[PDB]
Subunit: 140 residues, 3 copies
């Protein structure tokens, strides 16, 4: 029930790395050289139709993160998006990062969400947390 | 099921959906900010929100700002029970300063459905095929 | 319904900071000194078994983010993972960041997800958004 179409011969069908993996691994359709502390938008050359009740989160893989300081920016693929799915890769490492066509460089998660109507009110109910934020619960 | 919000000042803007089925409500800065290269700022929305039960509000980055200006969103977990001013923690990872003006959509808010499970310690867990596989265990390509 | 086991004497059972906090706070099992612009994989020394229908997202705490420019990389703990839960911490601040054993340095969110079957199709339906992305809706 996750539907995709290839936009070029360079796309690879996403794959799940394990039986209960949260993500479908996304493959680069092209080579990219990302200098240290730089970014690139990596084309997958796929369009997707997400199942009703979710959006597609482009999320980072752990190996690339831990090994090479690679992160994923942006990442919110909308249910109504019909364009090329682009992975916004951040290279926070000291080294340049090579992406080759067919490298799995991010993963796609079908994050379940509500599409709530927004409503303005004058006052919200109170809660126990209240305005507590930004470390209000402490360090340890 | 509604997302309720209240303006904490006249400088707040009602969040808006960018497209009919956009996962997020765009969040507007209530203030001007000049964010230096490789620095962060907590952008005040001057709204408080009441999330529908069984979700939290994820402050997520917009893709244009990410792809074009190396802007990212830190933190981002707005709890169901938060009634404070919603802050967007913006990271400017670019080499140039980033300008936020009051009224700019600088992030989006997603109603992420979650569980609130009770936590239970056990002697050991069931085994799986993945097992202790992680950090690239499945390969590069 | 979120089961965990301690992998060592140095782990701490995850705790919620408020009644309806999205995250279970994760505690470091070790001391780390993370220099500026560096990363570390902080070991929790716990294994977890997430409830069916979610994955465990390691998310950053706002206190650490706003005060110290601490961010969380990777973060996708899969339902089938039985290894040591690692927190990929990125220190983007000017100062080194000290993690002490027992510090709450991230949180784990039980994000509800679909595990869809993937299906390749010829083409997808048209939407109003279409291929609009990357700021197509404007700045303000
Ligand atoms: O990582 C991403 C993020 C977004 N996108 C595409 C799909 C998404 O539906 C579209 C818009 O995403 P966002 O709303 O998160 N970004 P922004 O608000 O800047 O774009 P827009 O003005 O079009 O809504 O951009 C990608 O291809 N990769
Ligand atoms: O991006 C954010 C993240 C959090 N917050 C606020 C709302 C949230 O409910 C509250 C607590 O967030 P976190 O639990 O993610 N951070 P931390 O654990 O540091 O704060 P606390 O100790 O108060 O729980 O801080 C923001 O305003 N913007
Ligand atoms: O922050 C993280 C991310 C992942 N992990 C572990 C748990 C997760 O189930 C496993 C694999 O996560 P990802 O699939 O997100 N990363 P990657 O694809 O690089 O690893 P693998 O090849 O094993 O699937 O690594 C952590 O402990 N901490
Ligand atoms: Mg994986
Ligand atoms: Mg948008
Ligand atoms: Mg980041
Ligand atoms: Mg907290």
């Amino acid at each position: 029930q996750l539907r995709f179409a290839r936009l070029s011969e360079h796309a690879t069908a996403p794959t799940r790395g394990s039986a209960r993996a949260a993500g479908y691994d996304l493959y680069s359709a092209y080579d990219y050289t990302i200098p240290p502390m730089e970014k690139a938008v990596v084309k997958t050359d796929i369009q997707i139709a997400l199942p009703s009740g979710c959006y597609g989160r482009v999320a980072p893989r752990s190996g690339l993160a831990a090994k090479h300081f690679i992160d994923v920016g942006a990442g919110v693929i909308d249910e109504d998006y019909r364009g090329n799915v682009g992975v916004v890769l951040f290279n926070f490492g000291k080294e340049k990062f090579e992406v080759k066509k067919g490298d799995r460089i991010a993963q796609l998660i079908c994050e379940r969400i509500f599409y709530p109507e927004i409503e303005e009110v004058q006052a919200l109910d109170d809660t126990e947390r209240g305005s507590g934020g930004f470390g209000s619960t402490g360090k340890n």
